[PDB]
Design an enzyme around this catalytic site. Structure first.
Site, PDB file in Angstrom:
ATOM      1  N   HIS A 169     -10.457 -23.241  21.244  1.00 40.52           N
ATOM      2  CA  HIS A 169      -9.409 -24.078  20.630  1.00 40.52           C
ATOM      3  C   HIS A 169      -9.937 -25.499  20.314  1.00 40.52           C
ATOM      4  O   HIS A 169      -9.709 -25.995  19.208  1.00 40.52           O
ATOM      5  CB  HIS A 169      -8.166 -24.154  21.545  1.00 40.52           C
ATOM      6  CG  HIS A 169      -7.025 -24.968  20.997  1.00 40.52           C
ATOM      7  ND1 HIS A 169      -5.947 -24.363  20.378  1.00 40.52           N
ATOM      8  CD2 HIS A 169      -6.786 -26.297  21.079  1.00 40.52           C
ATOM      9  CE1 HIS A 169      -5.109 -25.338  20.065  1.00 40.52           C
ATOM     10  NE2 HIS A 169      -5.568 -26.518  20.466  1.00 40.52           N
ATOM     11  N   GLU A 170     -10.630 -26.138  21.277  1.00 37.11           N
ATOM     12  CA  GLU A 170     -11.189 -27.494  21.109  1.00 37.11           C
ATOM     13  C   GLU A 170     -12.259 -27.513  19.998  1.00 37.11           C
ATOM     14  O   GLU A 170     -12.193 -28.353  19.074  1.00 37.11           O
ATOM     15  CB  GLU A 170     -11.700 -28.084  22.445  1.00 37.11           C
ATOM     16  CG  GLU A 170     -10.646 -28.130  23.557  1.00 37.11           C
ATOM     17  CD  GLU A 170      -9.315 -28.745  23.145  1.00 37.11           C
ATOM     18  OE1 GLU A 170      -9.288 -29.532  22.174  1.00 37.11           O
ATOM     19  OE2 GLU A 170      -8.283 -28.355  23.725  1.00 37.11           O
ATOM     20  N   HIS A 175     -10.709 -27.303  16.534  1.00 37.17           N
ATOM     21  CA  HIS A 175     -10.305 -28.630  16.007  1.00 37.17           C
ATOM     22  C   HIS A 175     -11.550 -29.327  15.468  1.00 37.17           C
ATOM     23  O   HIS A 175     -11.515 -29.857  14.356  1.00 37.17           O
ATOM     24  CB  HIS A 175      -9.664 -29.478  17.122  1.00 37.17           C
ATOM     25  CG  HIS A 175      -8.232 -29.155  17.437  1.00 37.17           C
ATOM     26  ND1 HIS A 175      -7.257 -29.093  16.439  1.00 37.17           N
ATOM     27  CD2 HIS A 175      -7.640 -28.953  18.640  1.00 37.17           C
ATOM     28  CE1 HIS A 175      -6.108 -28.871  17.070  1.00 37.17           C
ATOM     29  NE2 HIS A 175      -6.280 -28.785  18.392  1.00 37.17           N
ATOM     30  N   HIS A 181      -3.261 -27.110  14.383  1.00 39.50           N
ATOM     31  CA  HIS A 181      -2.490 -26.102  15.108  1.00 39.50           C
ATOM     32  C   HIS A 181      -1.789 -25.116  14.161  1.00 39.50           C
ATOM     33  O   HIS A 181      -1.393 -25.514  13.052  1.00 39.50           O
ATOM     34  CB  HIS A 181      -1.456 -26.776  16.005  1.00 39.50           C
ATOM     35  CG  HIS A 181      -2.045 -27.462  17.196  1.00 39.50           C
ATOM     36  ND1 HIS A 181      -1.400 -28.521  17.802  1.00 39.50           N
ATOM     37  CD2 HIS A 181      -3.217 -27.233  17.841  1.00 39.50           C
ATOM     38  CE1 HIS A 181      -2.189 -28.900  18.801  1.00 39.50           C
ATOM     39  NE2 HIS A 181      -3.291 -28.152  18.863  1.00 39.50           N
TER      40      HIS A 181
HETATM   41  C1  LIG Z   1      -6.425 -22.354  24.280  1.00 44.10           C
HETATM   42  O1  LIG Z   1      -6.464 -23.672  24.940  1.00 44.10           O
HETATM   43  C2  LIG Z   1      -5.530 -24.534  24.555  1.00 44.10           C
HETATM   44  C3  LIG Z   1      -4.541 -24.254  23.554  1.00 44.10           C
HETATM   45  C4  LIG Z   1      -3.624 -25.185  23.209  1.00 44.10           C
HETATM   46  C5  LIG Z   1      -3.715 -26.405  23.889  1.00 44.10           C
HETATM   47  N1  LIG Z   1      -2.871 -27.475  23.691  1.00 44.10           N
HETATM   48  N2  LIG Z   1      -3.348 -28.415  24.607  1.00 44.10           N
HETATM   49  C6  LIG Z   1      -2.820 -29.763  24.646  1.00 44.10           C
HETATM   50  C7  LIG Z   1      -3.512 -30.505  23.447  1.00 44.10           C
HETATM   51  C8  LIG Z   1      -3.214 -32.015  23.405  1.00 44.10           C
HETATM   52  C9  LIG Z   1      -3.017 -32.704  22.139  1.00 44.10           C
HETATM   53  C10 LIG Z   1      -2.706 -34.098  22.153  1.00 44.10           C
HETATM   54  C11 LIG Z   1      -2.604 -34.800  23.382  1.00 44.10           C
HETATM   55  C12 LIG Z   1      -2.800 -34.146  24.611  1.00 44.10           C
HETATM   56  C13 LIG Z   1      -3.111 -32.764  24.625  1.00 44.10           C
HETATM   57  N3  LIG Z   1      -4.985 -30.318  23.349  1.00 44.10           N
HETATM   58  C14 LIG Z   1      -5.346 -29.581  22.272  1.00 44.10           C
HETATM   59  O2  LIG Z   1      -6.503 -29.388  21.920  1.00 44.10           O
HETATM   60  N4  LIG Z   1      -4.163 -29.184  21.595  1.00 44.10           N
HETATM   61  C15 LIG Z   1      -3.048 -29.740  22.172  1.00 44.10           C
HETATM   62  O3  LIG Z   1      -1.819 -29.560  21.868  1.00 44.10           O
HETATM   63  C16 LIG Z   1      -4.410 -28.004  25.342  1.00 44.10           C
HETATM   64  O4  LIG Z   1      -4.994 -28.639  26.214  1.00 44.10           O
HETATM   65  C17 LIG Z   1      -4.673 -26.660  24.866  1.00 44.10           C
HETATM   66  C18 LIG Z   1      -5.603 -25.743  25.223  1.00 44.10           C
HETATM   67 ZN   LIG Z   2      -4.980 -28.445  19.998  1.00 44.54          ZN
END
Ligand SMILES: COc1ccc2[nH]n(C[C@@]3(c4ccccc4)NC(=O)NC3=O)c(=O)c2c1
Ligand SMILES: [Zn+2]
Length: 251
Positions: free
Chosen positions: A182-183, A186, A192
């Site tokens: 996921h990271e 981005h 998303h």
């Molecule tokens: C599959 O792993 C995942 C999937 C979705 C996730 N969502 N988050 C929180 C988040 C965030 C965005 C802004 C501020 C804080 C956190 N970090 C990110 O990369 N996307 C976000 O919404 C995870 O940490 C995360 C991990």
């Molecule tokens: Zn994200």
């Protein structure tokens, strides 16, 4: 696809928290965990057809693993991503996630300028179930300068981080693979997946959500480990603009 420019080489950093709690204070345990995780994330990337045709074979490989065995000693009032205390609240298990990603990018700036991406692996319980953060989707693949008025130098936005601690426990390796995917997603330019596009956020009967869904995918549904058509469209545009800039030949 250029086979001489198809791999995003990574600087992987394990902080003292990761070394102690994931690597059991051992360099071999630390590096094996990271090597295997990146290789499984690479399988998802390398097998993705970004145009749904022959535009595949793009992946990631580790160039270097930095292993921080102990906390970074700091002067009073000075901060470092590898310091013992969390920031801004030293009483909490974890840093504020945004501040940690910015700090890491500042401290690793010299190294980040020479690699496609830098990725921090840590072991801290970010607030509200957050597992990681990354730039891109400005920033992402290939160093892009940002002049920090606070830091008084250029930092590079080709960075991201993964924590393997969530809610007081070590996450499953199947969950950790998804965070890093996921990271890096981005970093590769994907945003998303939105609810408003059924193709990009299917129901559980249709295989569930894709990797870029904002709510953490668990890995038990088919689509969880895969990129949606929304992610592919975004990333395809990035790879087509970035591979020639900083991708290298697969080792
Ligand atoms: C599959 O792993 C995942 C999937 C979705 C996730 N969502 N988050 C929180 C988040 C965030 C965005 C802004 C501020 C804080 C956190 N970090 C990110 O990369 N996307 C976000 O919404 C995870 O940490 C995360 C991990
Ligand atoms: Zn994200």
């Amino acid at each position: 696809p250029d086979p001489m420019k198809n791999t995003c080489k990574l600087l992987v950093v394990a902080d003292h928290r990761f070394y102690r709690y994931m690597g059991r204070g051992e360099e071999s345990t630390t590096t094996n965990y990271l090597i295997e995780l990146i290789d499984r994330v690479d399988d998802i990337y390398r097998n993705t057809a970004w145009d749904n045709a022959g535009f595949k074979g793009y992946g990631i490989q580790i160039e270097q693993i930095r292993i921080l065995k102990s906390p970074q000693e700091v002067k009073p009032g000075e901060k470092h991503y590898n310091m013992a205390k969390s920031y801004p609240n030293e009483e909490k298990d974890a840093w504020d996630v945004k501040m940690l990603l910015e700090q890491f990018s500042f401290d690793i700036a010299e190294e980040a300028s020479k690699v496609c991406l830098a990725h921090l692996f840590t072991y801290q319980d970010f607030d509200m179930g957050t597992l990681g953060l990354a730039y891109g989707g400005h920033g992402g693949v290939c160093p892009k300068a940002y002049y920090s008025p606070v830091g008084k130098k250029n930092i590079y936005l080709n960075s991201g981080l993964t924590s393997t601690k969530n809610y007081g426990k070590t996450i499953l390796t199947k969950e950790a693979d998804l965070v890093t995917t996921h990271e890096l997603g981005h970093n590769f330019g994907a945003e998303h997946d939105p609810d408003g596009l059924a193709e990009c956020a299917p129901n559980e009967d249709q295989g569930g959500k894709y990797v870029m869904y904002p709510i953490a995918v668990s890995g038990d549904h088919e689509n969880n480990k895969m990129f949606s058509q929304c992610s592919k469209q975004s990333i395809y545009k990035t790879i087509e603009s970035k591979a020639q800039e900083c991708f290298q030949e697969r080792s």
